[PDB]
Coordinates of N, CA and C and ligand atoms in Angstrom, one line a residue:
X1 N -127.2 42.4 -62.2 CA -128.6 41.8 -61.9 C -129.4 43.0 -61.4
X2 N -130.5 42.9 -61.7 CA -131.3 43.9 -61.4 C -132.6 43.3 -59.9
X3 N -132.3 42.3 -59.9 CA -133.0 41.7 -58.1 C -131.8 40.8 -57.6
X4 N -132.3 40.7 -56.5 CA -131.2 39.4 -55.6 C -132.6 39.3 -54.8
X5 N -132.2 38.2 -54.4 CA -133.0 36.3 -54.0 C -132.9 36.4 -52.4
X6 N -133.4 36.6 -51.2 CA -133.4 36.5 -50.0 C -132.9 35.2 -50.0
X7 N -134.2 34.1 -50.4 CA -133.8 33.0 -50.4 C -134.0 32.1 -51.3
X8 N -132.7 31.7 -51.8 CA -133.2 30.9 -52.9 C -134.3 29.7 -53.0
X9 N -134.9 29.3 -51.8 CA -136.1 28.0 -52.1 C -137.1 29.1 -50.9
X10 N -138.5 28.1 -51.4 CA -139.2 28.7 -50.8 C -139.5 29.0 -49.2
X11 N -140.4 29.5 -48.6 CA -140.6 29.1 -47.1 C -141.6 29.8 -46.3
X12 N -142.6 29.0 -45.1 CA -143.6 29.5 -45.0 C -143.9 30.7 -45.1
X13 N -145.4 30.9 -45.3 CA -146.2 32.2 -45.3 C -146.2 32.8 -44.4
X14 N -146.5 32.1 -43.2 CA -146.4 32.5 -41.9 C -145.2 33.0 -41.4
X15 N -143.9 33.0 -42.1 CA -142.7 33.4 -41.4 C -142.8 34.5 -42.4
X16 N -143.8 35.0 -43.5 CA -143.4 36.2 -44.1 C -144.0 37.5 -42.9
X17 N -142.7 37.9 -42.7 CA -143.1 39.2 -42.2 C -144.4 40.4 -42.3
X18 N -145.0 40.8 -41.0 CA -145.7 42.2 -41.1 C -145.3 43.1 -41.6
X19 N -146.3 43.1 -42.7 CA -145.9 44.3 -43.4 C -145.0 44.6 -45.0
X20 N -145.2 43.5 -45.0 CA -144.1 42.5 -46.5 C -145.0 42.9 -47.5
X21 N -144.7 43.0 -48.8 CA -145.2 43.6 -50.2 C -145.8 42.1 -50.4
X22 N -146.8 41.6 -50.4 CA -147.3 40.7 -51.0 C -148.0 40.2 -51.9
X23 N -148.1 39.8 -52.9 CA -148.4 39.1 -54.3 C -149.0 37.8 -53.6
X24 N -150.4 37.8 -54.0 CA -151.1 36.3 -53.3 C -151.1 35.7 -54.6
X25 N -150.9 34.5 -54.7 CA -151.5 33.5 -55.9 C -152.5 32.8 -55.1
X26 N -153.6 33.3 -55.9 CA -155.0 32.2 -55.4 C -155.8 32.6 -57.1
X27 N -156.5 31.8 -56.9 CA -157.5 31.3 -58.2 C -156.7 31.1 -59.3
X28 N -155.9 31.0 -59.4 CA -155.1 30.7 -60.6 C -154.6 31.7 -61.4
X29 N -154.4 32.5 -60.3 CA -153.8 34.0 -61.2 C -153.0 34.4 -60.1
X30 N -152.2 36.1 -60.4 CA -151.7 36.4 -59.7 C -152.2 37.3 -59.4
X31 N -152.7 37.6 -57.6 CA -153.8 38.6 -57.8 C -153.6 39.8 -57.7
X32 N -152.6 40.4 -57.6 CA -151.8 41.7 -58.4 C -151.0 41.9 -59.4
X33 N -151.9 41.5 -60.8 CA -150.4 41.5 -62.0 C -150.0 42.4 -62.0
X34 N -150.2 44.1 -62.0 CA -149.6 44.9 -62.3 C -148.9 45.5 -60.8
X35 N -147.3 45.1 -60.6 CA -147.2 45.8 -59.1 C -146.5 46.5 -59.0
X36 N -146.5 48.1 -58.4 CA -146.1 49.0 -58.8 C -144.8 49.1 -57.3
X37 N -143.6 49.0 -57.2 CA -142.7 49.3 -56.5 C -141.9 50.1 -56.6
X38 N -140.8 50.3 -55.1 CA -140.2 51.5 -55.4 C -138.2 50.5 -55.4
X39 N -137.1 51.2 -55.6 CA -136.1 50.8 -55.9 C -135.6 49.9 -54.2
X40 N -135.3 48.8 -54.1 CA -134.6 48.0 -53.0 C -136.1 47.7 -52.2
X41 N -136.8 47.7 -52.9 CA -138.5 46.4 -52.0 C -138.2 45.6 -52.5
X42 N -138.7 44.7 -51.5 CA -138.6 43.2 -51.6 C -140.3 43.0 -51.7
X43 N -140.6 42.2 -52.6 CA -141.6 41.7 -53.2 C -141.9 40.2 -52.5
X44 N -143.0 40.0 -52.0 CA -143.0 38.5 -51.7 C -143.9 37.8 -52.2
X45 N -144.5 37.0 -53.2 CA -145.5 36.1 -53.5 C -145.8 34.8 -52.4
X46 N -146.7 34.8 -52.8 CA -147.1 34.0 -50.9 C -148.3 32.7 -52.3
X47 N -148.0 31.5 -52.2 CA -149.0 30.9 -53.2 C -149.8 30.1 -52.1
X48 N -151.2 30.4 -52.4 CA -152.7 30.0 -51.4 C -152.7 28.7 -52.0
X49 N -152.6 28.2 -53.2 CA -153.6 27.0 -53.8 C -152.7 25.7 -53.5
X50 N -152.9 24.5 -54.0 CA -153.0 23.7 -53.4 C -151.6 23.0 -55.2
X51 N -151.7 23.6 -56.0 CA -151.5 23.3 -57.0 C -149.9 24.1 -57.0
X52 N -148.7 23.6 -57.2 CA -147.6 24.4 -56.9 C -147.6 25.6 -57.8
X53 N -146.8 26.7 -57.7 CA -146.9 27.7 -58.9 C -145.6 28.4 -58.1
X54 N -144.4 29.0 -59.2 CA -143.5 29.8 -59.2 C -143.5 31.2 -59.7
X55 N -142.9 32.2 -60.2 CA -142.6 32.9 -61.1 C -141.2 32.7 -61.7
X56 N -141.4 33.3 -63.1 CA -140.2 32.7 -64.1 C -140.3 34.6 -65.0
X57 N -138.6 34.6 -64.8 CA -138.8 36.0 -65.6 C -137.6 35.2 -66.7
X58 N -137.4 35.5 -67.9 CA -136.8 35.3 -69.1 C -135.8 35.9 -68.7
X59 N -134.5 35.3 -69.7 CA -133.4 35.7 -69.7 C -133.6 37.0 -70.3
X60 N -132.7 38.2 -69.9 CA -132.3 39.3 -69.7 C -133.1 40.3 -69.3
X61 N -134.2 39.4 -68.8 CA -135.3 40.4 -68.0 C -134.6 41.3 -66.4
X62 N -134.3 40.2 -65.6 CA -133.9 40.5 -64.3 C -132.2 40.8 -63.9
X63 N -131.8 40.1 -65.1 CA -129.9 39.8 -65.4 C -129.9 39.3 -66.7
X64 N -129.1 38.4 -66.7 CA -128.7 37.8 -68.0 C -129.2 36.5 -67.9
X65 N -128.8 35.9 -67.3 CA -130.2 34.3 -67.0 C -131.2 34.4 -66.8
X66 N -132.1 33.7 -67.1 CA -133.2 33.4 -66.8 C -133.6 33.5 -65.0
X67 N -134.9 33.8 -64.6 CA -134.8 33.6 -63.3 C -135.7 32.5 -62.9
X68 N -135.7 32.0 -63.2 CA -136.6 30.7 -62.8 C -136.6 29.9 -61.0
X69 N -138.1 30.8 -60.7 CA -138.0 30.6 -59.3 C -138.6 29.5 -58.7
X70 N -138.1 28.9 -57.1 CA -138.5 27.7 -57.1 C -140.4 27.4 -57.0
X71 N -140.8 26.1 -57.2 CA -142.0 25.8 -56.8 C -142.6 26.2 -55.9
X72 N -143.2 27.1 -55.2 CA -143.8 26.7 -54.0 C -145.2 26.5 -53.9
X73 N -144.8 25.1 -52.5 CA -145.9 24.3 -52.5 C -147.4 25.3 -51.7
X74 N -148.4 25.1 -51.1 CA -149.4 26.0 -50.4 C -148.9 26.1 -49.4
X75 N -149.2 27.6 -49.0 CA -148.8 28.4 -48.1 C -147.3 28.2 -48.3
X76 N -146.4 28.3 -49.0 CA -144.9 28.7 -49.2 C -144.9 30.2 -49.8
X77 N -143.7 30.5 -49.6 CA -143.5 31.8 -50.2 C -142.1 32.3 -51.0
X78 N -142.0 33.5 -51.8 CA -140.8 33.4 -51.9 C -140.7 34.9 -52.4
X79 N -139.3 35.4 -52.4 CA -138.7 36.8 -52.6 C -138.4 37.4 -53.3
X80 N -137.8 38.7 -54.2 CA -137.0 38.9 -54.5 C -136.6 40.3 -54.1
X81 N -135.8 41.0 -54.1 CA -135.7 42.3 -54.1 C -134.8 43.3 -55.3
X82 N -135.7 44.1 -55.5 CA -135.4 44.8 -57.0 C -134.9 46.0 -56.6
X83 N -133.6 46.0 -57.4 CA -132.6 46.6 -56.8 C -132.5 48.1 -58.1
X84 N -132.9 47.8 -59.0 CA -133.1 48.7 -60.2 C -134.1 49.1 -61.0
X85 N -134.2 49.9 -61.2 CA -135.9 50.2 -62.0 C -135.9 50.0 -63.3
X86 N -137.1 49.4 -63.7 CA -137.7 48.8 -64.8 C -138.7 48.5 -64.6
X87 N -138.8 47.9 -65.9 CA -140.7 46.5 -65.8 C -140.3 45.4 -66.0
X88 N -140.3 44.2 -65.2 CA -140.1 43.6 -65.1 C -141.3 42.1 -65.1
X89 N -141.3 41.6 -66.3 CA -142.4 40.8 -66.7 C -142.3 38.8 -66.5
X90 N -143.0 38.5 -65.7 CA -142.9 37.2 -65.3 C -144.4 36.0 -65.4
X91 N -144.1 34.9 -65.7 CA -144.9 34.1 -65.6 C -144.6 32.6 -65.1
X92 N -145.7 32.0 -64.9 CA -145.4 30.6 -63.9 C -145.3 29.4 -64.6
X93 N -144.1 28.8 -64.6 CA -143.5 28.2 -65.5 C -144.1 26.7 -66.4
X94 N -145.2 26.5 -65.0 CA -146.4 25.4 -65.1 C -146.8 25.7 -65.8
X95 N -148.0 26.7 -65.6 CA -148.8 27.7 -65.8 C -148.4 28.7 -66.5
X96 N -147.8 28.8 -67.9 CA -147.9 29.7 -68.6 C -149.0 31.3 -68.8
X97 N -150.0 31.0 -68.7 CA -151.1 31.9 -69.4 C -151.3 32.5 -68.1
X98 N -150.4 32.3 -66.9 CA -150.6 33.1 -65.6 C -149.2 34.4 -65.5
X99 N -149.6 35.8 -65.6 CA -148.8 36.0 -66.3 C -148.7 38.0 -65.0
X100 N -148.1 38.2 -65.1 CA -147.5 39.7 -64.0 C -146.4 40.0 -64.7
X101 N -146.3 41.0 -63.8 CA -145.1 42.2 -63.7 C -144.7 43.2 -62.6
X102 N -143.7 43.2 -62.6 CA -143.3 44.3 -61.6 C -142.5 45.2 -62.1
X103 N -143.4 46.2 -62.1 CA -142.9 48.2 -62.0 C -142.2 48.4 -60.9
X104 N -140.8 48.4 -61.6 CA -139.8 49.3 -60.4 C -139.5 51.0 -60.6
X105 N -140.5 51.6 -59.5 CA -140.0 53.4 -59.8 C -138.9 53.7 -59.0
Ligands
LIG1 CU1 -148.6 28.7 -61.4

């Protein structure tokens, strides 16, 4: 696998740490698609809106499964940490046409 999961479901925004790599979902996008990281950051998406939204990376993107991450509701958040470099390309499983990536240098 090329990330591991702090936590597998989501959990408040407020418990995301100072100082955390954040990815906001608000307006119906993700408002850093292109995120440029370095090897073992943990990435956090933190979702603002009121409408649930995940990220979903395809199988053999991240591993060999699919990574299909949980819903989070507003103000939830959720992890991963990229343990390998690549590009790593994700979208919201609802929400298709909402669509990122993460650059691991
Ligand atoms: Cu979404």
């Amino acid at each position: 696998d090329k990330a591991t999961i702090p936590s597998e479901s989501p959990f408040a925004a407020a418990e995301v740490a100072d100082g955390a790599i954040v990815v906001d979902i608000a307006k119906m996008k993700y408002e850093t698609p292109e995120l440029h990281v370095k090897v073992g950051d943990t990435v956090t998406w933190i979702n603002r809106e009121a409408m649930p939204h995940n990220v979903h990376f395809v199988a053999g993107v991240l591993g060999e499964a699919a990574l299909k991450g949980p819903m989070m509701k507003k103000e939830q958040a959720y992890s991963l940490t990229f343990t390998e470099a690549g590009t790593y390309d994700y979208h919201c499983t609802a929400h298709p046409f909402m669509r990122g990536k993460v650059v691991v240098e």
